[PDB]
Design a protein around this ligand. Structure first.
Ligand SMILES: [Zn+2]
Lengths: 149, 36, 143, 61, 129
RNA sequence: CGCUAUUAUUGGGCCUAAAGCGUCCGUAGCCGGGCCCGUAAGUCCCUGGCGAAAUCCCACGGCUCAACCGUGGGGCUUGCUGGGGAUACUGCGGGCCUUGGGACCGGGAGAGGCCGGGGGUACCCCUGGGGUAGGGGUGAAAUCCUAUAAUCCCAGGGGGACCGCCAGUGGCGAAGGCGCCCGGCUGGAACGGGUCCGACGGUGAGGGACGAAGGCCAGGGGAGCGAACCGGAUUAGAUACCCGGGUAGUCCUGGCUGUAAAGGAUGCGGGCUAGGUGUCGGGCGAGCUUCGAGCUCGCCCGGUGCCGGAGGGAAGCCGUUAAGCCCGCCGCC
RNA sequence: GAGCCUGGGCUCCGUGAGGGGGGAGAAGUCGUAACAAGGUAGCCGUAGGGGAACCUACGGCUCGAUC
C-alpha cells in the first residue's frame, strides 16, 4: 500500500504459469456458470463468489475452466452492477464516515481519512469516464451518494 | 522573517535573537512616525 | 536526484528554468538593467574634463603610513564633483586651482579603487593640455 | 535456480467426511468456513495462514 | 515507478560486470531487449542468452565473459541522419572504432556501421563499450 | 568575448562550506509496464521548385609575389514547400495480459483519533484534637510564618491540575505529536491469500487542509508553578545569577494567529551493487512443555537499530534504512 | 484637424524645519555578553523588561562537558 502511506508491503497471490486446466476438477463450465449465478442471487460480491468457489468447490481460475470472467458471465446474464463494486465500496465508506463526523466535529484525524477516500474515488471516476463504464459527466456528490447506497 | 542560519554563530557577532528584537522596534517606530 | 527536466518534450520548462536562475548572477543583471550607466558620473566615457576646486591629502590605510595627494574636480559634463589622485613625486606642485584637468580611471578590481588608497576612483592625466609625466620629469612647461 | 518463478505454498486436498462419507476437494489456506455439501458440518476452520483440518486427508494434489 | 526496462537491463549488466559475475537475470523482458542482446552477441560482448517463460512477461538469462567496460541507454532517443554519426561517436565512445552505437531504423535494429553501409539514419537507443 | 564546469543541453551543486518548502492532498503540464492489428502525424531515405549578390573554404589565372581582382567547385541563409517509399521507436485508434496500483475476506498487533463513565497517589485550604518554642532557607545570612499557638502528629470536609514504578536501544501516526482503567463510535498499515478490477500509475507550478510553545477575542475557572512587579542578601556597582512573595498565563468551551535547532540540519517513486548481529509484528517448520494467547532454534515477508568488506567522499564519515551506479518529476543556491 | 485653455493619469527630476538607520576612520569613554563547564552550558521561536553589550519565563535542539 503505497498510494498515500508509502509502505512497500508484499502480501499477494502466487498464481502458477498455467496454459491449461487440471484434470482433478470435478465441475464443468456450465455447472460453474450456474454456481456463479446462484451465489450472486444469494447476494455476494464477485470477490467473495470466487473465494467461495476456491474454498468450498475446489475451483481455481473460473477463467481457466470457463473462458470468461465472473463479471462477463453476469453481464451475459442480467446481474451486473450499474456502477462498479470497488467504487461502490468506497462511496459507502465515505457516507458512513460523514454521518460519524456530523456527530464528532473535533475528531480531526478521521477527516483526513475521508479526504483520502474521496481522492481515491475521484481517481477511479476519471478512469471509468475514459473507458466508458460511466458517462463522461458523472460526478461524485455525497448528498446523492446517500441515495446511491 | 527570512532568516539565515549563518547569523546564529556568535563569532564576530552579538546574538541574532536580540538583533531581531531591535529590528522590530526600529520598524514600529518608523511606522508610527510615518503616520500609521 | 536526477536533474530535471530531461524529457524529449520539456524544452519550454528548461528555457524557463535557465532564465529564472540567470538573474542570480550580478553581471547579467547589471548589464541588462544598465545600473553603471545610471550611477556613473562619466556617463560611460573613458575620460572626462574638469576644473580644480581644492587640493587635498588622504591617509593611507594601515599598516602603511603616508599622505596621498589628491584634488577635487568639478565635471563640465554634469557639474558633479569627484576626487582624483595625482601620481608622481611632486605632481601636486604642478597643479594650481581653477586649472582644467583630464580624468581617467585609476585601475582596480571591478573598475574601482586601487591599493592602499581608500575611496578614490580616478586619476589625473593632463593639466592645461600637457602630460603630467612630462611635467614631473621636467621636459615641458605648464601654460 | 532461485526464486525466479514464484510458486504457491498452498495446496488442494481431497478429504473424507466421516459421518456421511462424502469426498471433497478443498483449499488449504481458506478465508471462509468450509462445510460439507450434504451434512452441513464444518470440515476446515479458518485461521491466519493455514486452516485447521477437522476431517481426514486422503490425497494431496 | 518503472519507466524504462532497457536502461535497467544495461545498468544491471554494468554493475554485475564491475563485480565479476557470470550469469545475470533480467525480469521484465522485451523485444527491444532481445534485439539489443542479439547485436551484442554478434559483436562478441556477451555469451549465450536465453528466454524463459513465466506467466507474466518472460525473463532473460545472460552469460558474461568479461568484455564490457560500460553499457548504457541513450535518453532521450535522439534522431540522427546518415551524415551525422561522428558527433555522437565522439560524445559517447572513447576511440574512433571502439564500441557500438545501437540504432533503431525502419529496417530494424542495427549498429551505426551497418546503418552507414545502408545509408540510413534513425534513433539512438544504446551504447556499448 | 574567452579565462569561468562562477549559469552547467553537451556540463555544476543543496548532512556539516550558499542551498530540500514545517507536513500532506491534488489541477494544468512533464514522465510513463508487456503482446497483436491498423494508420502514417512526428522520425529516416530518394527525388522536383525556392532560400539575391557581397561576405566564408579550396584550386587555377592576372597585378614583381602578396594583400586585391577574375574564372570554377563547395558551403551559408538556423528553414519553407510539391511528390515517391519505409514502419523499428514515439503519437492516434481498436482488441488482449497481469507483474505495478486499487478493491475484498481472514485470524492477529498497536500510548492512531473522538465521546462517556469510574478511579489513584501526591499537593493547597478549612474545621475539630494533641503539644509548645521555634520553623523555613543558604556557601553564610536576612526578608517571611509563628505565643491571635506556628513547624510536627491524628480525625474529617472541600477543591484544581497530573496519571509515577512496570517503560525499552520499544510501539502507532503525514508531520506536529500520542502513556491510569472500562465501554461505545471511527481512521490507517503489515502478514496470509490459484479471491475481484485490469495500467486505473509517478511527480506536482498555481490552489487547498493540518500544523509545538507563546500571543489575541468572548465566556468560565484558578491548587501548584510563575514573565512583569515588590521586597532581602551578594556585589567596587547589581536594573542578574541565590532567597522570600506575587499579576497575566498555564486548564475548559468556541474562534483567530500560521510561526521553531518545525533537525535524520539528508525532497518523493522505481531497478541494481557482500553481509553479520540484535529487536517488534505476522506466517511456516522443528523440538521442549508446568499443556498456557507458554519456552527454545531456524526460514519468508515487512518495520526499527548497531557494526562493517568492496565502493564513495575535502575530510569528519556514509556504506542494500547510501552521502554508490542508472531511469524520472518538483523546489532551492 | 493644428494650436490655446481647462480638469485629469504615470514617470523622472530638484529642493525642505526636523527626525531615522547604515558604512568606513593611528587613537575618547562604560562595562566584559561570547570562544575552556569562558566563571549562571550555549543556541532557535514567542512575549515582557533594561544606560549598553544583555536578563527572565514557556516550549524545543545539541551545533554540550563531568561523574
Ligand atoms: Zn459430511
Amino acid at each position: 500500500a503505497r498510494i498515500h502511506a508509502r509502505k512497500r508491503g508484499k502480501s499477494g497471490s502466487k498464481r502458477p504459469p498455467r496454459t491449461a486446466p487440471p484434470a482433478w476438477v470435478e465441475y464443468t463450465a456450465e455447472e460453474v456458470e450456474a454456481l456463479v449465478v446462484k451465489l450472486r442471487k444469494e447476494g455476494y460480491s464477485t470477490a467473495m463468489i470466487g473465494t467461495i468457489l476456491r474454498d468450498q468447490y475446489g475451483i481455481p481460475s473460473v477463467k481457466l475452466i470457463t473462458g470468461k470472467k465472473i463479471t462477463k458471465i453476469l453481464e451475459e446474464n442480467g446481474l451486473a452492477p450499474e456502477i462498479p463494486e470497488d467504487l461502490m465500496f468506497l462511496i459507502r465508506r465515505a457516507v458512513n464516515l460523514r454521518k460519524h463526523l456530523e456527530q464528532h466535529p473535533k475528531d480531526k484525524h478521521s477527516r483526513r481519512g475521508l479526504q483520502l477516500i474521496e481522492s481515491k474515488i475521484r481517481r477511479l471516476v476519471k478512469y471509468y469516464r475514459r473507458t466508458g463504464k460511466l458517462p463522461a459527466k458523472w460526478r461524485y456528490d455525497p448528498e446523492q451518494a446517500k441515495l446511491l447506497v | 522573517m527570512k532568516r539565515r542560519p549563518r547569523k546564529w554563530k556568535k563569532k564576530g557577532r552579538m546574538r541574532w535573537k536580540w538583533i531581531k528584537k531591535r529590528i522590530r522596534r526600529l520598524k514600529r517606530q518608523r511606522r508610527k512616525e510615518r503616520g500609521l | 536526484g536526477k536533474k530535471a527536466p530531461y524529457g524529449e518534450f520539456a524544452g519550454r520548462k528548461l528555457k524557463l528554468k535557465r532564465k529564472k536562475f540567470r538573474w542570480s548572477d550580478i553581471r547579467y543583471k547589471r548589464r541588462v538593467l544598465r545600473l553603471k550607466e545610471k550611477s556613473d558620473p562619466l556617463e560611460g566615457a573613458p575620460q572626462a574634463r574638469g576644473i580644480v576646486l581644492e587640493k587635498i591629502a588622504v591617509e593611507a590605510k594601515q599598516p602603511n603610513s603616508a599622505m596621498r595627494k589628491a584634488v577635487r574636480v568639478q565635471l563640465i559634463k554634469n557639474g558633479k564633483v569627484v576626487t582624483a589622485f595625482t601620481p608622481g613625486d611632486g605632481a601636486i606642485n604642478h597643479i594650481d586651482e581653477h586649472d582644467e584637468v583630464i580624468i581617467e580611471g585609476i585601475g582596480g578590481p571591478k573598475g574601482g579603487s586601487m591599493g592602499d588608497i581608500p575611496g578614490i576612483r580616478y586619476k589625473v592625466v593632463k593639466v592645461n593640455r600637457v602630460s603630467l609625466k612630462e611635467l614631473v620629469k621636467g621636459r615641458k612647461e605648464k601654460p | 535456480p532461485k526464486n525466479l518463478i514464484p510458486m504457491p505454498r498452498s495446496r488442494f486436498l481431497r478429504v473424507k467426511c466421516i459421518d456421511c462419507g462424502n469426498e471433497q476437494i478443498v483449499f488449504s489456506h481458506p478465508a471462509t468456513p468450509v462445510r460439507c455439501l450434504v451434512c452441513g458440518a464444518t470440515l476446515v476452520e479458518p485461521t491466519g495462514g493455514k486452516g485447521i483440518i477437522k476431517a481426514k486427508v486422503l490425497e494431496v494434489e | 515507478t518503472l519507466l524504462d526496462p532497457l536502461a535497467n537491463a544495461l545498468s544491471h549488466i554494468t554493475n554485475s560486470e564491475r563485480v565479476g559475475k557470470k550469469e545475470v537475470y533480467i525480469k521484465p523482458a522485451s523485444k527491444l531487449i532481445g534485439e539489443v542482446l542479439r547485436v551484442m552477441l554478434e559483436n562478441g560482448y556477451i555469451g549465450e542468452f536465453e528466454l524463459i517463460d513465466d506467466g507474466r512477461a518472460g525473463i532473460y538469462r545472460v552469460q558474461l565473459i568479461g568484455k564490457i567496460n560500460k553499457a548504457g541507454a541513450i535518453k532521450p532517443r535522439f534522431p540522427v541522419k546518415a551524415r551525422d554519426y561522428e558527433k555522437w561517436e565522439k560524445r559517447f565512445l572513447p576511440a574512433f572504432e571502439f564500441g557500438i552505437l545501437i540504432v533503431s531504423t525502419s529496417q530494424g535494429v542495427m549498429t551505426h556501421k551497418e546503418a552507414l553501409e545502408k545509408g540510413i539514419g534513425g534513433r539512438l537507443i544504446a551504447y556499448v563499450y
